[PDB]
């Protein structure tokens, strides 16, 4: 019930984090991943 | 090494086969028990078009009509889109009109778009006529192909055609 | 049961992502965030 | 700008006030409504030790650290650790030994550790006795102080002290 609410908090954390990752160091999202 | 880098996004309903298309093209790998995509990732492959070597930079994310922080960065600088459906679930075809709109709303105006009916190996279970799908693609100014990420059927040619349409 | 599971999938995704972020661009995890 | 960067990590049970100790120190901010920390973040502040300017780089993450992909990179390079408990909660103080064991496992054996009893404003509800914890601290070679992120009580002094012992 509020398991759903933690889920979207997590998802939203991923999205806000990914925005910054995409803008600054997108290479880290490459499959497969080379430093 | 490469002459052009083309960013191409994968789009369409969850479960249609987007990530396995990506893994088929970039790695020649397929996963039957693949789960829904958490987050955003991409993979690359170089092809020949004209004299030229083109790095295809292919982006993948979950198919979700909901707004996300990541949407604008996902379409940003994307020069082509693969809009995919599962030929064995008419619903995923029904939702195509909405993904087109998503591209109208978010992608560049000149984005080359290719409609892709995937899972063509599921021919017992076909729910989506090819001929109809193709009339729809022709009508909406779209490239069109059917594929099987599982077979490899037309997977290379899908990617070849959009990238040649981009070059 | 399945979304105890899904919460954790999300949580592992975050940790794997963060290991890469911490290792290549830790500044993205600064409060505040300067782009 | 600054003569040394000292990385300092915050550890200790969930709910003890780790993220409010961070935002108190670095921004002079408190949130009564703060939720469990998703992920890993940090914030910095510069202070004077001796002649020198010292950037405290203060890391925060949730919870009760089960071994995460995160944990090894979290302690890596930490020269200090604020091991926090809630003075109004005996269990958070009981778990201090587990946290210490984590720094044996994961931090450089040289790390400066400071025991911090947080929420000294809940002096009515006190479940942990100041004197017991100070003896325990000293028994184990830890610094000790009690703080209130809410009141500000001893917060600047906690940080000032661990950095001084580090310096
Ligand atoms: N039979 C068959 N199955 C396929 C094919 N392509 C993908 N699948 C399967 O369909 C399921 C969903 O595939 P995915 O590629 O993970 O789907 P998706 O579009 O990435 O889904 P989202 O992450 O939710 O957006 C998986 O079980 C795949 O193995 C195909 O060409 N033929
Ligand atoms: N009364 C009082 N409440 C505090 C104090 N410090 C923190 N709190 C409150 O206690 C609750 C938990 O605080 P947090 O700072 O989010 O705790 P945390 O240790 O970072 O928790 P996790 O992120 O779950 O690991 C929040 O409602 C805080 O506002 C304090 O010094 N006094
Ligand atoms: Mg996917
Ligand atoms: Mg916290």
Write a structural description.
- The complex is a heterotetramer, with 2 copies of chain A (35 residues) and 2 copies of chain B (167 residues).
- In chain A, 63% of the residues lie in helices and 0% in strands.
- With 35 residues, chain A is an all-alpha fold.
- Chain A has a single domain (1-35), classed as Single alpha-helices involved in coiled-coils or other helix-helix interfaces, CATH 1.20.5.
- Chain B has one domain (1-167): 3-Layer(aba) Sandwich (Rossmann fold).
- Chain B is 32% helix and 28% strand.
- Chain B has helices spanning 18-27, 71-75, 90-94, 96-106, 130-139, 155-166, and strands spanning 4-11, 40-49, 52-61, 80-86, 112-118, 143-146.
- In chain B, strands 2-3-1-4-5-6 form a 6-stranded mixed beta sheet, sandwiched between helices.
- Chain A binds chain C through residues 3-4, 6-7, 10-11, 13-14, 17-18, 20-21, 23-25, 27-28, 33, 35, and chain C through 3-4, 6-7, 10-11, 13-14, 17, 20-21, 23-25, 28, 33, 35.
- The complex binds guanosine-5'-triphosphate (2 copies) and magnesium ion (2 copies).
